[PDB]
Design a protein around this nucleic acid. Structure first.
Ligand SMILES: [Mg+2]
Lengths: 236, 430
DNA sequence: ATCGACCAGGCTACG
DNA sequence: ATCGACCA
């Protein structure tokens, strides 16, 4: 496998979580593009070739390494496909393509939680730097849903349907659950640090990891994700 | 050189130039207001009539007298605009026809600008009135219902920054080394206003932050994007060049922004064609060195910094995401008198270099010169005293887009921009 | 926009 | 519209 050593006081942190171990060679097998093709797991269109990988491999295949430029093009999608088979409850898959999206209903108490539904949404991409360095970029959105409808409701229509008072408190609650503001709607001293702890916490829960690292399984080999934000150093 | 997923900080010391040869530090509103009131703005606007019209529906209102009071004193004491009188025009009813009558009545008396008060938050009425005034006279709008529970002292002195700029004045400019940076920076691109329609913009800036010329395309569909993007950019350079014939542009930078059709390869093609055509036409130097950058405030990245800086990175931090993409920290928690402020988490700006005609030896040196310049331009904002988490080359087009999209959505007057010189050289969008 | 802003000294506001 | 932010 590939081991990423020290991937990257005056230290900065970014919402990129490194895959320090991954298979240095993967099985890939290409077929000509056809216009009826529709995107899905274990295949990726590149130009007029359709590359199959992972569980899409069956009999006839080539083996390509991290030195080939094709490795990063495929491993960026093949990574997300693997992570999509490793979602832990109560998180559910919402969308999978070039981006992986997971959702959970927020069950912590908040006023007006009998009419307005709230759901963390982890937005997961893959970052590819150096030539052999990969990591998952995770962002966090919060979706506001009318519980009657399970359907998205904007800040405008909540005031219309339920009153301005309701909307105000729902906004403050979303900012509190984002850790952008206090539950009392006030700016505080550790907002950015608490936001990063929330990302790291929701990410470790979404993929059923109790610990700093966790290993996932691919047909080519095992990947290992370190659930600590990447460090950025000042240049020498 | 330039190691990746490391960070370098812009060398600090950037200052404003406020007039009487005086320089105040950035990120210090108290020093700037003290300096303005001792030395004036960088350029007091020269006015025709020395007369400002205030239009409202509140006859003999005390708050209107306090407002007119704060305006009159601060326009003289902070901005050094002397001997200004404020004539009041009362409109009988809060509808467009009634208000337009008083507007037109104010134009006929001879005024340099119109300060209009409206009762509530009426988006269609506001934009129908704003689009009308934009085509006629510098204007500044206010809401009566909100200035009731505001401290009118902060409300007015912040409000006057953009109004002085609309009258042609120059509150402050950046102090920049003349040996570094671009001769002009062109903020260009397009913004979707509907699901199907959009408009192109291009805005020419000096490296000191001042806007020299600006054009917008007519509202078109995405199939016409690249054509009007090229035409819009060429017309802004035409206007820039005819108003600056003595300026040989030898280094040029394009700041491309806006939610626009996803045609990156085609867009780069057309943009490089435009520079080559401008070279042929002698609008820029025949050997101009240029670069095309993509600036996006929307992206999934967050950067956490020093616990002594609200866990935020410092101003001017340049994180290298990959070989040609960077994250720039434009804004940070700022020292006030009794300590550091509390902030909601601040997102950096994504910067991607898409094209250049530099040699390999000067590449990394030039990249960090225009990255520094992007941070510098994020300190130019005449919309108020508080800083904007955007470079001016992206902030001002966004302000233009907000007016264009809403006027088109709610039925206001067409801007007719190419014909009017004032609209091309004044920040009517503030 | 859900909220409050900016000077040195010191009428702790205003400038 | 005081301004300052901010999914796609
Ligand atoms: Mg304005």
């Amino acid at each position: 496998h590939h081991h990423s050593q020290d991937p990257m006081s005056g230290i900065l942190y970014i919402n990129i979580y490194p895959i320090v171990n991954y298979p240095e060679t993967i099985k890939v097998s290409a077929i000509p593009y056809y216009e009826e093709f529709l995107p899905g797991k274990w295949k990726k269109r590149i130009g007029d070739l359709i590359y199959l990988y992972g569980y899409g491999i069956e009999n006839e295949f080539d083996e390509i390494d991290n030195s080939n430029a094709l490795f990063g093009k495929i491993f960026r999608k093949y990574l997300l496909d693997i992570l999509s088979e490793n979602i832990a409850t109560p998180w559910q898959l919402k969308e999978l393509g070039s981006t992986l999206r997971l959702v959970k209903e927020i069950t912590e108490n908040y006023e007006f939680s009998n009419i307005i539904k709230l759901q963390y949404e982890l937005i997961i991409n893959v970052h590819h730097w150096q030539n052999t360095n990969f990591g998952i970029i995770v962002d966090l959105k919060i979706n506001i849903l009318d519980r009657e409808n399970n359907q998205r409701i904007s800040y405008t229509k909540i005031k219309d349907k339920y009153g301005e008072s309701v909307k105000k408190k729902i906004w403050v609650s979303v900012q509190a659950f984002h850790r952008h503001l206090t539950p009392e709607g006030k700016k505080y001293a550790t907002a950015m640090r608490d936001k990063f702890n929330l990302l790291t916490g929701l990410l470790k829960e979404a993929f059923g990891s109790s610990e700093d690292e966790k290993t996932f399984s691919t047909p080519d080999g095992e990947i290992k994700i370190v659930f600590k934000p990447l460090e950025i150093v000042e240049v020498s | 050189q330039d190691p990746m997923m490391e960070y370098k900080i812009v060398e600090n010391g950037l200052t404003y130039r406020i007039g009487n040869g005086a320089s105040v530090p950035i990120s210090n509103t108290g020093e700037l207001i003290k300096g303005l009131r001792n030395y004036g703005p960088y350029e007091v606007p020269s006015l025709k009539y020395n007369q400002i019209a205030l239009i409202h529906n509140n006859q003999f209102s005390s708050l209107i007298n306090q407002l007119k009071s704060q305006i009159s004193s601060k326009i003289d004491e902070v901005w050094h605009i002397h001997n200004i009188n404020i004539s009041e025009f009362i409109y009988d009813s809060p509808h467009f026809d009634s208000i337009k009558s008083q507007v037109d009545n104010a134009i006929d008396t001879g005024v340099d600008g119109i300060m209009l008060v409206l009762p509530e938050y009426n988006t269609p009425l506001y934009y129908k009135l704003k689009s009308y005034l934009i085509n006629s006279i510098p204007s500044q709008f206010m809401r009566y219902d909100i200035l009731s529970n505001r401290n009118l002292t902060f409300y007015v002195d912040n409000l006057l920054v953009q109004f002085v700029s609309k009258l042609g004045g120059k509150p402050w400019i950046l102090n920049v080394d003349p040996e570094k940076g671009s001769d002009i920076i062109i903020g260009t691109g397009a913004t979707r206003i509907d699901n199907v329609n959009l408009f192109c913009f291009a805005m020419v800036f000096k490296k000191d932050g001042t806007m020299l010329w600006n054009e917008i395309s007519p509202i078109v569909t995405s199939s016409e994007y690249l054509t009007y993007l090229k035409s819009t950019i060429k017309k802004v350079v035409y206007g820039f060049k005819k108003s600056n014939p003595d300026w040989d542009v030898e280094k040029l930078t394009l700041h491309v922004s806006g939610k626009r059709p996803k045609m990156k390869d085609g867009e780069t093609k057309i943009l490089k064609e435009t520079v080559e055509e401008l070279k042929k036409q002698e609008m820029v130097s025949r050997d101009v060195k240029y670069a095309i950058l993509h600036l996006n405030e929307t992206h999934p990245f967050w950067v956490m910094g020093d616990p002594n800086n609200r866990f935020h990175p410092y101003e001017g931090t340049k994180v290298k995401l990959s070989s040609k993409r960077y994250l720039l920290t434009l804004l940070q928690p700022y020292l006030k008198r009794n300590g550091l402020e509390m902030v909601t988490p601040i997102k950096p700006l994504s910067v991607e270099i898409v094209s250049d005609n530099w040699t390999s030896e000067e590449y990394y040196h030039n990249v960090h010169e225009i990255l520094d310049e992007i941070y510098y331009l994020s300190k130019m904002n005449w919309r108020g005293f508080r800083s904007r988490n955007l470079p001016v080359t992206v902030n001002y087009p966004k302000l233009v887009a907000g007016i264009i999209a809403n006027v088109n959505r709610y039925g206001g007057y067409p801007i007719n921009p190419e014909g009017n010189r004032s609209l091309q050289t004044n920040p009517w969008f503030l």
